[PDB]
Design a protein around this ligand. Structure first.
Ligand SMILES: *[C@@H]1O[C@H](CO)[C@@H](O[C@@H]2O[C@H](CO)[C@@H](O)[C@H](O)[C@H]2NC(C)=O)[C@H](O)[C@H]1NC(C)=O
Lengths: 49, 50
């Protein structure tokens, strides 16, 4: 009697992920009180206007 | 001499003789920049035999 039983496995995984998230904003004001200028020109990202 | 009053808001100021003008040319400029980058790579190999 003779017997032979042969197995191979070869799994492979390759994952890649990239993000770019660029945000830019330039509120500009002339006129009005310096405090109201700085309060309004400070960009609020949830309400950018 | 001086004593020409200069009003900024309610406050009247006396301009020094040395000063040609001091004047509230009020302005403002806010610059915001936010650049985020991510990279990942994730490799696996499972060679196996019997
Ligand atoms: C390479 O072998 C490892 C180890 O067996 C594998 O990780 C197992 O994967 C299974 C299925 O996702 C999970 O149930 C086990 O909990 C994992 N074990 C560990 C220790 O993390 C892996 O998935 C194999 N890779 C490939 C590409 O087949």
């Amino acid at each position: 009697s003779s017997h032979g039983c042969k197995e191979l496995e070869n799994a492979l995984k390759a994952a890649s992920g990239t993000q770019n998230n660029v945000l830019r904003g330039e509120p500009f004001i002339r006129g009005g009180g310096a405090g109201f200028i700085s309060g309004l020109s400070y960009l609020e990202l949830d309400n950018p206007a | 001499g001086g004593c020409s009053p200069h009003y900024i808001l309610n406050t009247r100021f006396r301009k020094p003789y040395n000063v040609e003008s001091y004047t509230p040319q009020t302005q403002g400029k806010y610059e915001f920049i936010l650049k985020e980058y991510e990279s990942y790579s994730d490799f696996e190999r499972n060679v196996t035999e019997k």
